[PDB]
Amino acid sequence: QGAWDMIDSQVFKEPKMEVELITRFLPMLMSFLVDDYTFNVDQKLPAEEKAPVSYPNTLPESFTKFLQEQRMACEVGLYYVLHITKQRNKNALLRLLPGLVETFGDLAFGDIFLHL
């Protein structure tokens, strides 16, 4: 991802990663996914009474902070959005659709993610 940084100035050192990507962002993706499969198993389990609880559609905003402050977290979140769109789960989709509005380097608004 830092390739243009290596051509702009001759940078031959490795770019560094984020810790909260490892401990907050990607575990937040995995947070949303395992709750997703939990309400799926609950739907596939009988005996749900009137007025069931929807999937939590609240958004942890440190996730969006990493989207809008880290290009790597940005683009991997974009491809996560595309993958869940291929899975087409409306609940998580509109859960994470806020916060994608403000994202790093307009990557959510770039050619790649928009085309996909």
């Binding site: 575990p27 995995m30 947070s31 395992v34 709750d35 499969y37 939990t38 198993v41």
Partner: peptide, 12 residues
């Protein structure tokens, strides 16, 4: 920790 409790909640 949240993740592991959601894991164990899905097992149930």
């Amino acid at each position: 920790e949240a993740l592991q409790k959601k894991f164990n909640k899905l097992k149930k």
